[PDB]
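Q: Predict the bound structure with calcium ion.
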Amino acid sequence: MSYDIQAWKKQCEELLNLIFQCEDSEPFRQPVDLLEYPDYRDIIDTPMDFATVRETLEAGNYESPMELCKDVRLIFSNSKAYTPSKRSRIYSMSLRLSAFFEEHISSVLSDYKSALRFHKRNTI
Ligand SMILES: [Ca+2]
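A: Predicted complex:
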């Protein structure tokens, strides 16, 4: 629907589904095992992963798609910070998936911004 403040929830649910099914998401699907990799929290302040993102959205615990976007971007910035070189195949995966996410999220954010101005201002 045009001017739908709820539309982002379905749009982001679909986008996450397409990310989970993409081979490039494999390293990012689940929280890093902090017991297997006990230096991970030495480097990364705030772990994030696509399963946490998907559960947060399904729970209704994101206020806006900007919040979900900030979490997804944290996945990719965490991977950049943790991986040791741009030669890492894991970093390479994070670049391909990042570029895919950013291509699709822009219209979700734009559509949400317009919907919210309508929600706040309309005299229907
Ligand atoms: Ca790095």
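A: The radius of gyration is 16 Å.
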